[PDB]
Ligand binder design. Sequence first.
Ligand code: 8RU
Ligand code: 8RU
Ligand code: 8RU
Ligand code: 8RU
Ligand code: CA
Ligand code: CA
Ligand code: CA
Ligand code: CA
Ligand code: CA
Ligand code: CA
Ligand code: FE
Ligand code: FE
Ligand code: FE
Ligand code: FE
Lengths: 352, 350, 350, 347
Amino acid sequence: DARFDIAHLARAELFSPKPQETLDFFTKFLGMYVTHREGQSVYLRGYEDPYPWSLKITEAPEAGMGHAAMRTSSPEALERRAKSLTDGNVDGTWSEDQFGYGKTFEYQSPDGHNLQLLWEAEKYVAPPELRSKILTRPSKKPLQGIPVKRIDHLNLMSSDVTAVKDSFERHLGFRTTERVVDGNVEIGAWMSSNLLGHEVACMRDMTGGHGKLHHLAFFYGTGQHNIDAVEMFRDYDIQIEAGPDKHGITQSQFLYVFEPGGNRIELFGEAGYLHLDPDAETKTWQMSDIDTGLAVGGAKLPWESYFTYGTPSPLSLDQHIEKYAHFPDPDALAAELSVPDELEHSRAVADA
Amino acid sequence: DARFDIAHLARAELFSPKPQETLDFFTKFLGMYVTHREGQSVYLRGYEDPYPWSLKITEAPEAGMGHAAMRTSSPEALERRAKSLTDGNVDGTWSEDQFGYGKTFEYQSPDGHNLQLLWEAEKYVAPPELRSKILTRPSKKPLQGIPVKRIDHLNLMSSDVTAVKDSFERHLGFRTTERVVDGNVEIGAWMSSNLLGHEVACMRDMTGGHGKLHHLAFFYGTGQHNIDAVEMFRDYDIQIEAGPDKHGITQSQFLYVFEPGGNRIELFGEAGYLHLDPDAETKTWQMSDIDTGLAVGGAKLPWESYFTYGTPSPLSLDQHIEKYAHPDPDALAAELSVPDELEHSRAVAD
Amino acid sequence: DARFDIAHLARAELFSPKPQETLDFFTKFLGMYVTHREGQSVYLRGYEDPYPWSLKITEAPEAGMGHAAMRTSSPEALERRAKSLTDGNVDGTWSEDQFGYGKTFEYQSPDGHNLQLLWEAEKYVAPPELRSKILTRPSKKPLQGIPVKRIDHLNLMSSDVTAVKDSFERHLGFRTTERVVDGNVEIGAWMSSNLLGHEVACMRDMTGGHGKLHHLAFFYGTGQHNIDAVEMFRDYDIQIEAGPDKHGITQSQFLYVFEPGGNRIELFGEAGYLHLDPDAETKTWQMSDIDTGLAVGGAKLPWESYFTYGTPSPLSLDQHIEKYAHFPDPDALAAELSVPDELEHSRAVA
Amino acid sequence: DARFDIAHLARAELFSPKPQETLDFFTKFLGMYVTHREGQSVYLRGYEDPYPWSLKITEAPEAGMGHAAMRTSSPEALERRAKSLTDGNVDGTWSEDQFGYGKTFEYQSPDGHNLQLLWEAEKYVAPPELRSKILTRPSKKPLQGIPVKRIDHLNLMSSDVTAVKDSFERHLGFRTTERVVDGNVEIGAWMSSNLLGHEVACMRDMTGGHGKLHHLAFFYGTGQHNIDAVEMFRDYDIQIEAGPDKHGITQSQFLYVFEPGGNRIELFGEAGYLHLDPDAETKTWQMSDIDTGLAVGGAKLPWESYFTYGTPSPLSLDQHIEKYAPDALAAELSVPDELEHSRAVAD
Ligand SMILES: CCc1ccc(O)c(O)c1
Ligand SMILES: CCc1ccc(O)c(O)c1
Ligand SMILES: CCc1ccc(O)c(O)c1
Ligand SMILES: CCc1ccc(O)c(O)c1
Ligand SMILES: [Ca+2]
Ligand SMILES: [Ca+2]
Ligand SMILES: [Ca+2]
Ligand SMILES: [Ca+2]
Ligand SMILES: [Ca+2]
Ligand SMILES: [Ca+2]
Ligand SMILES: [Fe+3]
Ligand SMILES: [Fe+3]
Ligand SMILES: [Fe+3]
Ligand SMILES: [Fe+3]
């Protein structure tokens, strides 16, 4: 019974070709605290992240995810999960080289995403002047930007959603709370080891790419903060993809923006739907279900980015939107033909 | 100085070919109180509308606005406004035939919209069991749907925005707070006689049509109520056009839906930007300004309805969206008349 | 490792001497669905409660909690927890007499609270016309009142908080996320088996009573809905105890009211602080810590009800408030002397 | 017909004996822009204040209101209002000595409050990098604190509420939208020249004092910003008096705090009830009406500060709360018990 072996998503690393601008996004707009700098990397936490960092920004020639690490529910759970992966012929490596954390198992998803498992995590203790009167809160909410509380979840792009889902289910004990299917093909899976709808999702890469990041998400817990965040991004020249609105899938209040390095960042409002029922069936969204899945309100997710752009991208975001909006390309048409039309021409999709 | 002669938008009448479904939308979803029924009409108010009705639903073979009435700030202001219109060769009629109101001056905008001015308005008094402990609140907030407080504003579609704007400015003393221009052509004007951004707007009908209703708006004052409303509309099968989001123009939180009779209804969240500065210049939105004007967030206003559909429509809403989403030489004529920064804005979906 | 054996709080039963008024509170104000009636009981769920009921209202001569049931994470977990309790000399009984559920283990807390454990629970299926387009949502959000999504948590009053806490920790595998201490005495414990701050809390009965209910809580997930709920309760004559505000303890947005039968009901806004860190130390609130624990904002929790009234009460709520506000009683003064003054004269207490 | 002669509340000046801490409160917590410094004063605006300042912070030995200025609807309206006041034997002064503004009429309320009228007001224009894409918004919302949009309203404490009300009604053309009465005594009056419930209120000073400031208020327009603001104030050691909640009177979402200099500041959420009906009767709140007037929710307004403390105060805030938790008893006997022992009052 692996169900309870993974506790939560501890941290993630973003690659940025504009590391200072990425850093300024996370500090000046999202009010994250800087806890460490070393080499070409800067380490940040939200004010309610429990460990010394949840986000690592690393200078790189391209955008994308350096890794994501999940924290286990015990040291024994870490041994059981690492052994399951090894016995499943997954190549792993043991490391202990990150500030604030100990012994870490590194491996790749079936599509090449860098994933990590750990137990050993230091509990962040604030300097006295940053301690909160709220005792569950390890540091005061900053006075900068619209500050995020913590990391929320990860959305991976895969050439094969089922292979990534089966890895999380079989080796990590995750359940799939919700998925989107087109005939017999899984094009999205939302997975969790706890009450959350998901901490890890996987969506089909319609461009044939491998091992990409769709988005990293941070948590506000309040829908208004997405309204405040989008008004900030609009007036301070950050590109907005879609939202604020509410996904039918997970019932999460969402806002998607592009940080200056080109990674897609999601801001999450109200937690939404907690999976208290311990043996709920997977909810499967068909193409007849699909419209509400994307957005309860009037929001339209752009075809030319949402369904096709992740990081690293062989094209700039501008070049990507150009190509997939046809500003035809055989690649763009291949993507269009692989996607079912109820999804492609949904009232919750706009095609530039 | 006509600046202060119009107090507010008192009421509007919608025509509906599905009058019971229209009624059910306003009572079951928007929790409006029914205060009267007469002939082919039902009369409603939101719980903070001050007079016995703000909304009249009238059975008709087509959708659209039967009329809108503005209340003046005094009986003398009513005489001054009616005289200004008469002296400007606007042909008006005096009537006194509506429940809850008295003497009314009826006239047409330059584009044929049925407009009215009145002073005499009964103050709604609730039955004892519906009185509020909040003394400015004339009736308890209902326990039905996501209830609207009151009427908010009117958006008129016109072949000629400037002619409609000039009428409100010159004859009613309105100021234009904000407008959208493309070269020398005004494609929208937002007009007010008070601190509100607007109680009356006028937007260019890009199909060349005349005298249509773009939308009637009702007020919540809370952005969350647009979120609650859109979830209600989504799960109870009302068509949603755009929002919830926030218009840069007026800084209003908006949600646009179609009531079953085909009229566009807007739900307004937070009041937004109050015009306290008594001599602010008109803010002119160009096509370089335009994206934020439509929506601060990621909302996309559909080309195929928002810019082209109003009531009455020579086409059904489904037939309209079919035609303007495609080609039709009429749809292409509309596309060529609209500037591309507006047409291909990141705040427009085709 | 019992940590993961309990999944969540499935349901609770309230006793009411005004059963029809209690039912009207939960249906007309809180928009709960009625799924079953049997004997002198009615069974209700919120629109996102997974089983056919989360709330049972039972006619009785006094208010209070008939029982609360927790659902296990497997059938094996139910056998393990029942065996732990039996091996600990706790008297249990096996039953299967409730609509929508199967085999149930009934036992009493160390202070006499009726607690139950079960695995077998039917999944509620709505009639076709009440199914949601939101596939995690088993039934549409109703158009009545400010509807609650689901049951949230339980707050038990005990003569001995530690005895109740040790039962949940040792027999059910709960962790204590937060607690309030006065010297060496635990006067509150907040306990969870999952990411929630708590599904079960226990607070010290300062009157020397045993086995009472402090409150049952339902979930909105949205702070505005506590604002909407309190405005509804205010204008429709429900007694409001405190809030809306936010507890420092759990970081939960709260509103406390009394349902007409005399039970204290809490409405919860935003989920607040999720316990993602699997081995966080218990956070201990002292009397120097205390003010923020009660309320982040300006809310004052009334001494004369919050700290002293639970159900069943030897007095009516009005008689209770009379006695503990001294409208002195040696019993009221005994309660005052047992409570530390930092708690009693906190800026978060009136 | 003076009804339309006053447009809005342009600005106010606060006195502070802790001028730097007061400044830090308005910049670090409330995100106000500093536009000028001169002598012992600093000038600030919210990002949607139309003129170069709405707030002036002035070093002084005691807290309180230096002045409040209302903007008229025309230059002629300024001449008419000034003439009405002088014809009523009110002592007025003409001045033109403030940054961002021109010709000003200064006078005192019947109770000694420093009030001003002006027409001439410069329109603030942001530097290019601070201009908003929202064209009605003259400067970007700052990235600092929970920033206020603009000044909202003023609440004056008076030994005689009726005398202050009569001045605003008869000389400035304000209407009283709502008031609280006890028998034939006005305990509160909420006054407006526009759709707002009020831009000026006056409440009875139960201590027998004269000419005090109860509070100055700033606008968010969003209830959540009061929630965000109170959490900020709680964790950064600002004293919170009451709220967040909603006043039945005006239907305004409110939060009351003390800035470090001792002045009471109110943060306003949703605008609430707009007075569109041009000839609504004044709504009179009795002592049977009273509970909802104070707070729709569970909020309790503290007797020991809310009903008795204003600036300048002969006592520190701490000394005031100490005393009001013969003078305290005189205050208690003058206040009717339905107000004093309301479920919306804490002692
Ligand atoms: C399209 C549905 C969905 C749901 C939850 C997410 O966090 C997300 O990015 C997308
Ligand atoms: C397109 C800008 C705009 C602004 C305010 C409105 O009420 C509206 O309907 C439209
Ligand atoms: C006194 C702190 C507290 C915290 C959370 C609750 O749900 C509650 O009822 C009380
Ligand atoms: C006590 C009622 C009330 C109403 C509006 C306010 O601005 C205020 O400060 C007080
Ligand atoms: Ca296709
Ligand atoms: Ca064009
Ligand atoms: Ca039974
Ligand atoms: Ca004591
Ligand atoms: Ca003089
Ligand atoms: Ca008294
Ligand atoms: Fe996501
Ligand atoms: Fe509108
Ligand atoms: Fe509780
Ligand atoms: Fe105020």
